[PDB]
């Protein structure tokens, strides 16, 4: 008899963004794998709460693209270069058994 | 190029329009003033050579 259309709230997007902001801010005293463990925890905590309100919010999808690639860029800056060919995806997404960093992604979608 | 500067309208009401051929940026540049509001710092170039 009816349909419910869902979206993530604005203040929940902003709270996710501030959480990533303090990851990046308190990471000049962490090692690459802890920066990525915090990214993974925050991103699972968002995706598993919202789960289909995220698919329908076109402003999240952009937030997640920019935030994921800010985290990657802080790891480059941690080494001392941002050349895009010194750091293909393989080094970030390889699981941690094969020595990679173990990122989980949502920024390789088409928006 | 990087953008030069940076609610509701009635002409944009979707019940009053007829889209028979959809506007495109080629038209909006061919006729700067007909096809664009607030067209500022614009050169109107045309040629029927």
């Amino acid at each position: 008899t009816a349909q419910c259309f869902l979206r993530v709230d604005d203040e929940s997007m902003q709270r996710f963004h501030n959480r990533v902001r303090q990851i990046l801010m308190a990471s000049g005293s962490t090692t690459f794998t802890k920066i990525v463990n915090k990214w993974n925890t925050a991103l699972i905590g968002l995706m598993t709460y919202f789960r289909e309100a995220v698919v329908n919010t076109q402003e999240l999808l952009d937030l997640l693209v920019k935030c994921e690639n800010k985290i990657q860029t802080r790891i480059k800056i941690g080494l001392n270069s941002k050349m895009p060919s010194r750091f293909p995806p393989v080094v970030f997404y390889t699981p941690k058994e094969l020595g990679g960093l173990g990122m989980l992604s949502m920024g390789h979608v088409l928006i | 190029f990087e953008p030069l500067v940076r609610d509701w309208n009635e002409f944009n009401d979707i019940n009053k329009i007829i889209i028979r051929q959809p506007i495109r940026t080629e038209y909006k540049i061919a006729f700067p003033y007909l096809y664009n509001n607030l067209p500022h710092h614009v050169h109107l170039t045309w040629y029927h050579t």
């Binding site: 690639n69 | 990087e2 953008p3 495109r24």
Partner: peptide, 26 residues
């Protein structure tokens, strides 16, 4: 054609801002 799609400037966006048309459109 920038047909009202894409970014104003793909400069501080973390993408190249490249646009394409949904090939599975029909």
């Amino acid at each position: 054609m920038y047909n009202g799609i894409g970014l104003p400037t793909p400069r501080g966006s973390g993408t190249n801002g490249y646009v394409q048309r949904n090939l599975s459109l029909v």
